[PDB]
Amino acid sequence: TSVEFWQNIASGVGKWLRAIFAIAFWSSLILLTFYAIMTQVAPSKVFRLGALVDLIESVKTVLLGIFVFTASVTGIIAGVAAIANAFGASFAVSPIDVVNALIFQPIVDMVK
Amino acid sequence: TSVEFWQNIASGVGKWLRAIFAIAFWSSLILLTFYAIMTQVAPSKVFRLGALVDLIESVKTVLLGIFVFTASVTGIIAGVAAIANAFGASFAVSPIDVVNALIFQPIVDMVK
Amino acid sequence: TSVEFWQNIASGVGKWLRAIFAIAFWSSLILLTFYAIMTQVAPSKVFRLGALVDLIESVKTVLLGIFVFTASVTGIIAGVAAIANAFGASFAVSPIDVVNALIFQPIVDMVK
Amino acid sequence: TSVEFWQNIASGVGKWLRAIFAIAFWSSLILLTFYAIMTQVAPSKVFRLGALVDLIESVKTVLLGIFVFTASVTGIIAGVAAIANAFGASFAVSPIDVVNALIFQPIVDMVK
Amino acid sequence: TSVEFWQNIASGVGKWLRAIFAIAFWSSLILLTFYAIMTQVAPSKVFRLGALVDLIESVKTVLLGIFVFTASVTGIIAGVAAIANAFGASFAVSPIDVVNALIFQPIVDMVK
Amino acid sequence: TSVEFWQNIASGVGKWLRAIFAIAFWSSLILLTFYAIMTQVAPSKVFRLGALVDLIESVKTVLLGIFVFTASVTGIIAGVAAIANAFGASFAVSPIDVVNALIFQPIVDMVK
Amino acid sequence: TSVEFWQNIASGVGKWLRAIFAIAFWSSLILLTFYAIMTQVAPSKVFRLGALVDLIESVKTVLLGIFVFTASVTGIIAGVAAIANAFGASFAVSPIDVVNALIFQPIVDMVK
Amino acid sequence: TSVEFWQNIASGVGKWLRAIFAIAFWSSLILLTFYAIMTQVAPSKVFRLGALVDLIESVKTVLLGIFVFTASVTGIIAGVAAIANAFGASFAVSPIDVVNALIFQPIVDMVK
Amino acid sequence: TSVEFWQNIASGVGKWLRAIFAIAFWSSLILLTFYAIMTQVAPSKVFRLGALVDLIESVKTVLLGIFVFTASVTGIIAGVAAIANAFGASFAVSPIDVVNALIFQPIVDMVK
Amino acid sequence: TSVEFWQNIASGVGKWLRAIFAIAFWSSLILLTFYAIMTQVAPSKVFRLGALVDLIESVKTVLLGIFVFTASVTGIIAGVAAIANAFGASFAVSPIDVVNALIFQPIVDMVK
């Protein structure tokens, strides 16, 4: 119906999504903690060993997911910036600012 | 539904998990004590010897579990900090503070 | 063919599904009991230990499933209620009543 | 096919399982008795000593199993009761009644 | 190409499948026997104990599989019979006859 | 490929397994005899005492294994017979005949 | 690109696979030998007993694998031969020759 | 990479394993000799008696291990030979030659 | 707009794609290395075994992918060359040069 | 974004992985040393015997893992080299250099 309506809805959903993404990262951390208490308390050696293995699995998968997310954001922004070339068009969007704000800004300002 | 709802639930579950993790560490200590009384009271020499061996087993496994937990936390935090590089992004999260608060802060403030 | 026909079929299948869901929850409880007798009777220590571990696995998975179900119901109802906004539409559905009736009402009125 | 069919089958299997669980507990008691006669009759001192040790092993493992069972039942019921909160839902199930009926009611009414 | 061709092929494959299903049930029985001789001959106590545990595992899994099969057959036949209702259609198929012939008829007429 | 092929292979392996099971039982008997000659010839008192203890161990473990085997066979056959109920299905398999033929028939017809 | 090219590549990979399969069978034999020396040299009785048990495990699993392989080959060839029927088609492939050449021909011509 | 490479590696490891197995058998013999000198020199009667008992233990365990090894080799070879039947396949491997070469050929050609 | 514009863009994207394909192959190699360290460090035997299995999985899938890629390139080039026939048209493109340059040229000139 | 960026990241992760792999091998050596001190200090004979057995287990598993790693690397490189054939393509990669640099070069230059 009107432009600022869509602007407001997009901004709201964006902030909600980045907030819940930070919550998701810290939930991965708490799941790391849960596997820690599991390997601390599990009676048999084999269960503690399996808890250590899946702890390493969780840390590796969270790191890989973060890597893919940041790499994809940088890739899309740099691809659009480069595709502005070969045509003469100027794309001054400062990719570092957007890749910082979308990825690491919501994460940092949290205390557990 | 709302952001602070998820924030509160995550904070509550985090504090509960760290508290029960400290309880778990001190339960490992009391299990050490139980093996101590076992090797103190076991009539035959062989049973006292086995109690000593599994006492050493328990101390080694608790130390290894603590090592894996702290190493994994430091590894994930430092990996995200380093992956902030090569892209120009800034990740000022003070990894020492989080590795202290998640690992050793709940443990220290307990008296048995 | 006619409206009340579909109304009746939907109501019947809904009541059947909630009844069998309560049966499912209490079957999870009886499976907990089965693991209890397993760890009570299993001759070797290792089998009792594994029964304890999978008992904890069962309780954690049933709790997680209940959490996801209730959270999803609350999320859909609150999302529709909020999407009634930004347009002026009124959605007076009392989400608490529906999340109670769909989730906890069938469960409570059962005795094992 | 029909609701009361599943209700009857679940009730029957539940009563059978709790009865056999009480039988299991009293079988642990009779195994205690068997180790008692073993340490009473075993000719060499070492065999009587080992019978005493495994008698203590049996009593400790039965006590630990009972503890884990009752703690898990209380934990699941209290977790569902608490998860009824933060949403406004009411869960009036009287956890004490169910933890009594599932755990200690079948055990008490037996004479050996 | 022609109706009785498909009728014959379906009947043949059906009889072959039910015969091999009865063979499968009696092979589960012989596997029970193999675990019996294992726990009878295994030198160490721990191996006999594990053979007893996996013997119980095998009997429980065969019983659960038979239960799921018969329950699914009864469920599909009764569901089609009930779905004949609410429309006025008549479905006189005698579900007991089919659930007997598909499940227990091939099994009974075998001697090991 | 064909039904009677599988029938013949199953019957052959079944008879072989029951024959070797009877051989296993009588080998348990000969091991009892070996412990008897050990406690008869062992020079020191302690070795004769230990031979008596492990003789009792062998007899108790063979009796327990036989008990578990026969109880499991009776349990599976009676469970299938009872699960034929609640559905109307008839399961006329004469459980006593099968529990006799699988358990005690191969054992009896042997002379040592 | 051309027919005999694919013919040659398929023949080469087939001969390589059957040769390495024969190598695999004889490696199972050498693993049997390794468990033999383990149970011959293992100092404690329990380790020799476990080596005997896993030796039996290895022989049973190799025999079961060979059985499944030969049964599957015979089953596929006989199924295609039978499916040539009911349509009038002739399938003169001599299943015995192929089941011999694929299974036992590479194995026999080896000396360890 | 190539067939004769795997052939050579398998042959080499096989010869090494059979040689060390013969060394193991003769080491069992030298351990018999060590128990002989122990019972010859042990001052107290009880220690000589215990040395005699564990000497008998060693001879019985070496004989049992050799029996299990040769029986397992004969069993696997005869099982594959018999499983060649019921399918028409020919398995001309001369089981006696392989059971001789794998078991007794390395042992005989040694002088202590 | 102009021919050499499209020529330049196609050449640039082609070189970028072949470079990242070589990077992908060497990343498959480093993933092989990661599974190697996993099976080297994994505490329990089962985890090392699974790491070996998925290591073999990775090598087989990389080899199959390379095979499909090179076979598809050769197939398309040879198909166009052959379709030049039956019409009299000449297609002198030297398929070996293109299948070398597109497949193996980017891979070889890399050092890890 | 750019080629040398991916080149640098791949080279860095490769060197890090090979360094930590060498660390892993020497950690296997130190674990061998730990089992050595265990069997040196363990009071009862049975514990020293078990330490010897698991010492042999550790050496065998490290040797098997190294074998699988080097064999897989040689296999993939030789498979790609051979698949360069049958198409005319040239693959001059010197497999010996890569199998040396990826496997043994990081290991050798370490002093413990």
Residue numbers in the entry:
A (entry chain S), B (entry chain O), C (entry chain R), D (entry chain N), E (entry chain Q), F (entry chain M), ...: 38 to 149
Give verbatim lines from the article.
Here, we determine atomic structures by cryo-electron microscopy of three conjugative pili, two from hyperthermophilic archaea (Aeropyrum pernix and Pyrobaculum calidifontis) and one encoded by the Ti plasmid of the bacterium Agrobacterium tumefaciens, and show that the archaeal pili are homologous to bacterial mating pili. With structures for four bacterial conjugation pili (pED208, F, pKpQIL, and pTiC58 from A. tumefaciens) and two archaeal ones (A. pernix and P. calidifontis), it is clear that there is a common architecture for all and obvious homology, despite negligible sequence similarity. Each prokaryotic pilin subunit consists of two or three hydrophobic α-helices, with kinks appearing in some of the helices, such as in A. pernix and A. tumefaciens. Hence, pore diameters of all prokaryotic conjugative pili are sufficiently wide for the passage of ssDNA, but not dsDNA.
Cryo-EM analysis of the P. calidifontis filament preparation revealed pili, which following the reconstruction to 4.0 Å resolution, proved to be structurally similar to the CedA1 pili of A. pernix. While in the A. pernix filament the helical rise and twist per subunit were 3.6 Å and 76.5°, respectively, in the P. calidifontis filament these parameters were 5.0 Å and 74.2°. From the secondary structure and side-chain information present, we were able to determine the pilin identity directly from the cryo-EM map using DeepTracer-ID39 to be P. calidifontis protein Pcal_0765 (WP_011849449), which we name TedC (see below). Although TedC displays a similar fold to CedA1 from A. pernix, the two pilins are processed differently, with A. pernix pilin not being processed and the P. calidifontis pilin, similar to bacterial plasmid conjugative pilins, undergoing proteolytic cleavage. Notably, however, the mature P. calidifontis pilin contains an additional hydrophobic α-helix (α3) compared to pilins encoded by A. pernix and bacterial plasmids. In P. calidifontis the extended density could only be explained by a bipolar cyclic tetraether lipid. The cryo-EM map was good enough to identify the cyclic lipid as a glycerol dialkyl glycerol tetraether species (GDGT), a dominant membrane lipid in many hyperthermophilic archaea, including Pyrobaculum species, and we have modeled the simplest form, GDGT-0, into the cryo-EM density. Most of the pilin-lipid interaction network in the P. calidifontis pilus relies extensively on contacts with helix α1 in the asymmetric unit (ASU), but the lipid is sandwiched between α1 and α2 of a subunit in the neighboring ASU. Thus, the protein-lipid interaction stabilization relies heavily on hydrophobic interactions for P. calidifontis.
